Design a protein around this ligand. Structure first.
Ligand code: HEM
Ligand code: HEM
Ligand code: HEM
Ligand code: HEM
Ligand SMILES: Cc1cc(N)nc(CCc2cncc([C@H](CN)Cc3cc(C)cc(N)n3)c2)c1
Ligand SMILES: Cc1cc(N)nc(CCc2cncc([C@H](CN)Cc3cc(C)cc(N)n3)c2)c1
Ligand SMILES: Cc1cc(N)nc(CCc2cncc([C@H](CN)Cc3cc(C)cc(N)n3)c2)c1
Ligand SMILES: Cc1cc(N)nc(CCc2cncc([C@H](CN)Cc3cc(C)cc(N)n3)c2)c1
Ligand SMILES: C[C@H](O)[C@H](O)[C@H]1CNc2nc(N)[nH]c(=O)c2N1
Ligand SMILES: C[C@H](O)[C@H](O)[C@H]1CNc2nc(N)[nH]c(=O)c2N1
Ligand SMILES: C[C@H](O)[C@H](O)[C@H]1CNc2nc(N)[nH]c(=O)c2N1
Ligand SMILES: C[C@H](O)[C@H](O)[C@H]1CNc2nc(N)[nH]c(=O)c2N1
Lengths: 413, 413, 413, 413
């Protein structure tokens, strides 16, 4: 049974059926609902409970293939059953893992970038062992993805959970993020969103360097142990200085940003197994840096200042000065990234492509999970076509769930 | 059960309890869910189930007063219970109404303009009997709200619902909307969302004027009977012609819009009762006209034209040429409404005043129902505090529901 | 002894030999130098001193012909001597007259229109005797030249002056002009520059209408007699109402002007004869009305008002507000004229057309008399080629001279 | 004898007597006429042709002081007479020079700045001895007058002409001026009026830089010797980059202009002495950059382009596009110089003051020598009072004369 949804802009309608295949988990605009969280545990998933899911994942994987693969399918099911019954858990083939990481992306309902899903570099780092080693893998990763400014998407997978006590985790939210500091006059220099995390880093040893853009160290957690700190060697963090193609004074704001956006603190779910260490990256969309990173009040908040030097009437709020200023900032980001041969995509182009993605999804697998709230751009929203797209939002499997900030639960062994 | 609600903008965090007294009706971004609709009926609501709700609301009414008048309260509940007795339904004092309209405004979650909820003008018209009287009651409503420039808000309540066979309802979307016509060569002229309806109007005998800004006539329904067209007198329609502070050429586009946004076809629910005609108006928000009306591909869609006219790089999408037009078009709208002294609200001031309201509502009733998707303005979203506010969405009584539009069910006499 | 003459704009460089013929009469920018006036006299030009000037002209006339008839040159030269000896004066042949009016035009150093000179209607009114009769020829001239808006150049020539005591003249500076009146409160209303003359008319019987554009009557003198008033029928007075093509409000200044510019008060000198009655007209140049008639402080003086009305910064001198208004008014004039199918020439075309003329003159007769001060338009001067053209000013024969205005010398019967 | 002259705008007339004192020298609109030029010579000015002129000046000087200085005056008259009897020439006191330069400024009849005359830095450089020494002096002068943007007027005076074989002159017509080059395909780059000169320096060994705004070298001539080239230190050449305050695109024209207008190539006459080296500067009038430098066909010629940039009907003349652009360019010039904090006066302000200057001169020496052709701005002429003022032109003494340009008449060592 089918659910009707309409693109009010084109009149085109899809019939969504893939929903009636969803894990059945209005908590309305909540950023991190419980429904999308996967907490810690501390005994391994009951093996009885894991079995049906593993058959289901094996079944998904095999029915992904061009011709039927009967022989090897039946083989794999038996194989997997025995493995769980005898060992409590199971291991997945090198391929299975590729397929899952790609599928879980495809299933991520907040990612506008999804047209790229079939195209994802998969770093199998499951046999990883000290934080020493986690750090090395993460560099192998950043080097590949930064690709001399021609960003590519890639994922690095650290060994499954077992226990719920021997977790491999990156504690940082993103691989590369700017520090933020509470200054003695009560003011915040740096990135206010990160005041808390940086404190943690300082507490754990890091020398606080008191600057607008200091890159915070990796906080790496091997086998559930206490975390250890590593600094990403600077020449692997690729950055872009902001300038504006018309306004000189832009350069004087002395603004820059990193090229590579990588989520680190999220957990991957596959046929019942959980990986709490999987950092993945794509490339940036204009507005993320422009609108958010630079104009959000709780991030860099450069909006007021720019209005002032565009000489706008920053006091009559009705003059739309704020909107003008946003747009200039956003041109500046794109322009800088282009003037520099560093991959980046504007929100219009993104949305356009997402519409094509959404189209083939319905055409090919009967559906497409999507968070409208997340997918419609932080700026000039109803000008993009996704704005007028009725969309359904649901949890499939494989899937990327958020977990609980690691420090919130860790026991300092 | 108290539910946590954060404003990632400031940090300020609300507790929410009000959700609990919501007779609890992911249908994600669906424009009109069945959840939010009030269908047609052919019998009157059963004695049995109409009484509990009748009581419910009288309760609300009284425990909202100066203090608490104890036996108007038992003598009003005496009244109602014995009123359902002898004709199985009931009346509301010329005054329980003033309350429930103001209350159901307070309760409509998509309205960003709810700081003004107590400042409403109630036009009692529940006695009214030809459609041609409906017409006059509406023109009172209009001349009043238009107020020669300075807009005030008003609702007009028509007779409730007996058999359902005898409904009083306006078929229009809003009172003032522009007609849309499908031209000989297949092209469209006017407001293209309204083609549909303009068509219907013509079939009911309206002479089409084949013009971009023609005001479509009222289609009116006297208790059940077929509908009759009455055109509004042209000088009860206040309109603003568009021009730009900086762009003399903007006039050349010859664009204008109406002063007054009113909603004809929603149904009010009050402690059990249903009123299928209750038009209500407020004043316009900048974007509704600037962004939405003018820029939407399925509306006037002038964006391409304005960018040619500002000579931007209208072929390189990533030049943000779209985002600039949209700003400039909106300054035009905002500026034109000041130049001709007509109440208008830019989307910032709206947002801010909403945030103040939302704060009040959580302070004084422990909850504020809000549909994030509708409240965040259609341009420059994240530059308005509401974007960063987590919100809960729920239906209370009294409430304004959408109906299936008359022409689709109404049995043709 | 040719004089070098450089056009700094082009670099092109003429050699003037025609100044050698100048009757050799720094009076820098004086509007009416003594040497361009022909005063009254009160005895005929002495037979003696006239004779050579008559021959003079005669050779110049015949030496003008393509052909060259020697025996007619002699026949004419003979007729003339034998005419001057016996009458004391001579008579021009009809044809000689055409030639002479045309030549004096060519010889008018202040007239940018000269490209047109070979092409000019000549009305012979030398046999005229009553003032009423003068008035008839004049309306013939006006209907002819007005030509339903397609203006044509023409001159009407009244009886030569005989003894200086029997002059036929028009006292009016121009055939069509608006009255200026001195109001009781100090202020002036109408054409301030014309208060003076208006007064005289009132004095001779005319009823003042106290209106901004009131057409003054004709003040006509027939051989010596006190002048008489006739009003040109409103039908022969073609006018144009100013509107601007972007500013509706322009029409609110209720401005108009007349289509026909005719100098009436000047004196033609041919071969020692003086005709002090000879009005001639051409078509208007934009700027004459736009810059001069409307913006001269001592004329209609509308400039400040057009300023306020356009919204410019009219107390900051440096804002160039004075210069923007003058451009817009000047457009209104051209626009208005086009709009009503009435010949008008803008000052740019005029400039260029003069340059083509000047150059032909240098080619064909070795010189071209030219008053730089009068020829360079009253706005955007250096933008016209005549500005960078070095010129010589000098008096040839025939020639149009200024006269001492009649009322200043006339003795009244 | 008195000479009456009218201001047609104001009605006001002066009578002029100062002209009787003019050393008695139509040479019509000639830029650089014989009568205002001052020959080279090869003998000293014969002593007793000098004498009457020396007494004359000495008389003027003492006559300038508020209270008769009888003794000191007589002393100086004999002083001088002796000096001439015995040396065949004379020196003038440091003070007399200060007085002369100012008087001669007052007497230069083409300078609308003259309102300032009483107010001039006078660099005595009469002791000067080499071309290098000349260069030294000229910098003192530029750093002084440039005065950090706040322009001040100054004159530097090099040693009087002796036998006029040992002249001291700067061959450059102005101090700072841009080179103009004739490019290989005959197009002209830079300042086309300046081509032939720039070629001269190229030939005296300047390395041509082939840009738009190349500052030319100084061509210096000491003691009649051949000249030598010096380049002004670039940081003494203050320039203004041009931007319109409404049109961003203006900045894209990439125009700038120097801040200091200094005339070198003129000769000072005082009491029969000739100074062939006296460079003077004042500050700019808007128009001479905006209208002339930027719009003359023979200059930077931008008009066509700005027209295109502005959407104007550059193909239909009568649209007055040309007039509209010349305005905006001019605004840009003033606005640029104002924002960059550099003295400039606009042509209305200029003219309004000349008018006060004139009116004082009449009040107080019975005259004011004025070239109307040069005084009336190259734009909106009629809109400035001077257009309407009849003015007399004549040569007093002291006086700044023009010279045969040095390269025409230099005996090449
Ligand atoms: C072609 C490259 C990609 C682009 C252009 C892109 C674009 C985006 C953007 C703009 C967001 C929202 C970011 C924000 O709100 O702060 C997002 C969210 C997300 N994307 Fe992507 N994406 C890309 C690749 C990926 C990849 C490779 C994965 C993992 C396989 C992924 C999974 C997600 C997830 C899980 C979110 C949720 C955001 C959160 O709460 O942190 N995306 N994507
Ligand atoms: C005080 C003036 C008012 C302002 C400024 C205002 C503002 C707005 C805005 C901007 C919208 C969204 C428009 C759209 O998306 O098409 C809206 C929708 C709405 N408002 Fe208001 N409002 C006002 C008065 C009222 C009143 C008097 C009522 C009823 C008593 C009301 C109930 C609603 C409802 C139910 C909607 C949803 C409309 C729909 O789905 O068609 N508002 N309001
Ligand atoms: C094609 C038609 C003509 C045009 C466009 C034209 C243009 C002009 C203009 C623009 C002026 C200056 C007006 C002012 O500043 O007051 C002028 C002055 C003059 N033109 Fe013409 N002209 C035309 C025909 C004639 C004719 C037919 C004659 C006589 C044969 C003539 C002789 C003069 C004279 C004598 C002046 C100086 C008049 C004065 O001081 O009032 N022009 N002309
Ligand atoms: C307040 C300062 C001054 C201003 C604003 C000013 C303004 C002007 C202007 C606009 C011109 C016409 C320039 C042109 O068409 O190229 C001019 C010409 C002239 N001014 Fe000045 N002036 C100033 C000071 C001086 C000084 C200090 C002198 C010499 C002492 C001077 C002597 C002249 C001379 C001789 C000319 C004739 C220009 C030529 O053909 O080279 N002015 N002045
Ligand atoms: C794969 C990828 C691609 C891309 N273009 N951008 C990204 C952005 C990742 C990111 C960076 N900085 C902040 C965020 C989000 C806030 N916008 C993370 C977040 C924060 C919070 C408080 C809740 C939540 N659910 N998610 C996400 C990831
Ligand atoms: C009371 C009031 C105030 C105000 N400022 N603006 C308005 C706008 C009313 C309006 C005008 N034009 C179109 C609409 C709605 C779209 N936003 C119509 C609509 C269409 C559909 C398919 C669903 C829906 N729920 N509503 C609403 C109403
Ligand atoms: C034949 C012709 C053509 C044309 N296009 N314009 C005209 C303008 C005639 C005109 C109209 N209004 C005033 C004037 C002149 C000043 N502009 C009159 C005049 C006045 C004074 C005080 C002195 C003088 N020499 N000339 C002339 C004539
Ligand atoms: C002291 C001073 C002040 C000021 N505001 N402007 C100036 C003008 C400097 C200047 C710059 N470029 C050209 C000129 C003159 C053109 N108006 C040059 C010139 C050329 C010719 C051929 C003749 C002539 N007499 N004068 C002058 C000087
Ligand atoms: C499909 C999607 O829900 C639809 O385009 C909605 C989105 N948000 C909106 N928000 C407001 N305020 N008004 C609207 O019409 C819409 N349209
Ligand atoms: C309250 C609300 O959920 C929150 O501010 C969200 C809204 N939508 C978003 N959408 C994206 N893509 N990224 C964000 O950070 C947010 N913030
Ligand atoms: C004083 C000066 O001669 C007078 O204002 C002149 C200037 N130049 C002119 N030039 C033309 N063509 N017409 C005029 O009236 C004038 N007026
Ligand atoms: C030919 C004419 O004299 C030449 O183009 C003059 C005109 N008037 C001028 N007036 C000023 N002030 N400066 C100039 O260069 C000129 N040029």
């Amino acid at each position: 049974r089918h659910v009707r949804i309409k693109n009010w802009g084109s009149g085109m309608t899809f019939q969504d059926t893939l929903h009636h295949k969803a894990k059945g988990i209005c908590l309305g605009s909540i950023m991190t609902p419980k429904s999308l969280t996967r907490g810690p545990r501390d005994k391994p998933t009951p093996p009885d409970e894991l079995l049906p899911q593993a058959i289901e994942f094996v079944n998904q994987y095999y029915g992904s293939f061009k011709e039927a693969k009967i022989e090897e399918h039946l083989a794999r099911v038996e194989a997997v059953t025995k493995e769980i019954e005898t060992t409590g858990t199971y291991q997945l083939t090198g391929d299975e893992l590729i397929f899952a990481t790609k599928q879980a992306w495809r299933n991520a309902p907040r990612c506008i970038g999804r047209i790229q899903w079939s195209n994802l570099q998969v770093f199998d780092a499951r046999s990883c062992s000290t934080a020493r080693e986690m750090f090395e893998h993460i560099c192998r990763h950043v080097r590949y993805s930064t690709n001399n400014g021609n960003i590519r998407s890639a994922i690095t997978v650290f060994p499954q959970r077992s226990d719920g006590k021997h977790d491999f985790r990156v504690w940082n939210a993103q691989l590369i993020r700017y520090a933020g500091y509470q200054m003695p006059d009560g003011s915040i220099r740096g990135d206010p969103a990160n005041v808390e995390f940086t404190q943690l880093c300082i507490d754990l040893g890091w020398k606080p360097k008191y600057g607008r853009f200091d890159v915070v160290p990796l906080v790496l957690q091997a086998n559930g142990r206490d975390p250890e700190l590593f600094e990403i060697p600077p020449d692997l963090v690729l950055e872009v200085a902001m300038e504006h193609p018309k306004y000189e004074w832009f350069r004087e704001l002395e603004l820059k940003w990193y090229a590579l956006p990588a989520v680190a603190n999220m957990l991957l779910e596959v046929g019942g197994l959980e990986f709490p260490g999987c950092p993945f990256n794509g490339w940036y969309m204009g507005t993320e840096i422009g609108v958010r990173d630079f104009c959000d009040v709780q991030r860099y908040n450069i909006l007021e200042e720019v209005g002032r030097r565009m000489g706008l009437e920053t006091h009559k709020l009705a003059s739309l000065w704020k909107d003008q200023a946003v747009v200039e900032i956003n041109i500046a980001v794109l322009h800088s990234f282009q003037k520099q041969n560093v991959t980046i995509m504007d929100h219009h182009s993104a949305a356009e492509s997402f519409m094509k993605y959404m189209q083939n999804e319905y055409r090919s697998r009967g559906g497409c999970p999507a968070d409208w709230i997340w997918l419609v751009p932080p700026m000039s929203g109803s000008i993009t076509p996704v704005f007028h797209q009725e969309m359904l939002n649901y949890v499939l499997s494989p899937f990327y769930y958020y977990q609980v900030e690691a420090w919130k639960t860790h026991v300092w062994q």
